Amino acid sequence: LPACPEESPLLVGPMLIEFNMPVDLELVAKQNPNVKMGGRYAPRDCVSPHKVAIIIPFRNRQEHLKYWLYYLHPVLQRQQLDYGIYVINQAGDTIFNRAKLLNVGFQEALKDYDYTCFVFSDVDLIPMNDHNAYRCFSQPRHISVAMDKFGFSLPYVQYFGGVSALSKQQFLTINGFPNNYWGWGGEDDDIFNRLVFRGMSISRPNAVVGTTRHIRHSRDKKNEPNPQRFDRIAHTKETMLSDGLNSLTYQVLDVQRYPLYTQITVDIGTPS
Numbered sequence: 237l238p239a240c241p242e243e244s245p246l247l248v249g250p251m252l253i254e255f256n257m258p259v260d261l262e263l264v265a266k267q268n269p270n271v272k273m274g275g276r277y278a279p280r281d282c283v284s285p286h287k288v289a290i291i292i293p294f295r296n297r298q299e300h301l302k303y304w305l306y307y308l309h310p311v312l313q314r315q316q317l318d319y320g321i322y323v324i325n326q327a328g329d330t331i332f333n334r335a336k337l338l339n340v341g342f343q344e345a346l347k348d349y350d351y352t353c354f355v356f357s358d359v360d361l362i363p364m365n366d367h368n369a370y371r372c373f374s375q376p377r378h379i380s381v382a383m384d385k386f387g388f389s390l391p392y393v394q395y396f397g398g399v400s401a402l403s404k405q406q407f408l409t410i411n412g413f414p415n416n417y418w419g420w421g422g423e424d425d426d427i428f429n430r431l432v433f434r435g436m437s438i439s440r441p442n443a444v445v446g447t448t449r450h451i452r453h454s455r456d457k458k459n460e461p462n463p464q465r466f467d468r469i470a471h472t473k474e475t476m477l478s479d480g481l482n483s484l485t486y487q488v489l490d491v492q493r494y495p496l497y498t499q500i501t502v503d504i505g506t507p508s
């Protein structure tokens with residue numbers, strides 16, 4: 237098989253996105269026949285240089301997840317990616333830890349296949365243009381750059397939350413993500429700091445191609461704003477040396493291979 241072309245010729249650009257209808261994953265699976273068990277796909281006509289594991293931090297967001305799957309699967313295939321979907325489900329009902337779940341995703345997906353690119357995406361963000369590439373670049377990539385909830389622009393220029401892509405080397409270089417941001421906020425800013433402290437810069441598509449829709453929702457219980465966040469992001473340079481992949485432990489309770497994704501249910505504990 238020859239290599240796929242540098243840019244996929246299958247892209248259609250701007251798309252219509254809506255979240256007012258019901259979604260049936262059995263149907264979605266039917267519409268996406270080429271997606272194999274566990275939400276895995278690779279083009280059959282060419283070899284993709286992009287081996288992407290898409291990691292979604294998750295707990296009690298099944299409805300959002302169905303929309304995510306309905307919209308992303310067709311887009312990822314048009315992008316001719318060799319990819320896999322991983323939903324990292326936080327076991328239990330104690331305070332949520334978005335970034336720690338993302339580290340679990342990185343470590344566990346690597347046990348399945350030689351992925352060399354990682355896309356970290358919240359479950360309620362849908363790209364509006366398939367030219368917004370869900371793969372890695374020479375520098376860390378911020379993907380959800382123009383979200384409707386932020387008026388189709390970045391909330392601030394150093395904002396790196398929502399959807400992003402880091403190559404395996406970029407992720408390893410920053411010792412992954414922090415494990416101690418419990419509850420909402422700051423962990424994405426900490427990650428931005430990590431990248432800067434390791435000599436990297438943020439790469440982004442333009443505002444139009446990067447347009448993204450956020451499924452408006454209510455505040456989830458157990459993910460209250462972390463009061464220590466402003467304090468923690470001010471010391472990233474020092475804390476990133478000892479807090480991240482090199483200080484991570486967790487216990488996988490279950491791994492389910494659904495037609496459109498792999499769900500890893502994991503116990504990531506409580507604050508220490």
Ligand SMILES: CC(=O)N[C@@H]1[C@@H](O)[C@H](O[C@@H]2O[C@H](CO)[C@@H](O[C@@H]3O[C@H](CO)[C@@H](O)[C@H](O)[C@H]3NC(C)=O)[C@H](O)[C@H]2NC(C)=O)[C@@H](CO)O[C@H]1O
Binds near residue numbers: 398420421425
């Ligand atoms: C110079 C100065 O102090 N200016 C203040 C502004 O920074 C401040 O805006 C708010 O800043 C915080 C921290 O950057 C923003 O929080 C981030 O929001 C994103 C998106 O929701 C989230 O992913 C990040 O985790 C979160 N980080 C933290 C540490 O909480 C917040 O969204 C900004 N708000 C607005 C409306 O732009 C404003 C208002 O608080 O006051 C200035 O003085």
Ligand SMILES: NCCCCCCOP(=O)(O)OP(=O)(O)OC[C@H]1O[C@@H](n2ccc(=O)[nH]c2=O)[C@H](O)[C@@H]1O
Binds near residue numbers: 360
């Ligand atoms: N007016 C409505 C106020 C809603 C403010 C709640 C904060 O909203 P956001 O900043 O979008 O964050 P969030 O969507 O709650 O969390 C980000 C991501 O964490 C995941 N997440 C968070 C909390 C939870 O209980 N379950 C879950 O899966 C999910 O992938 C989500 O998209």
Ligand SMILES: [Mn+2]
Binds near residue numbers: 450
């Ligand atoms: Mn949200």
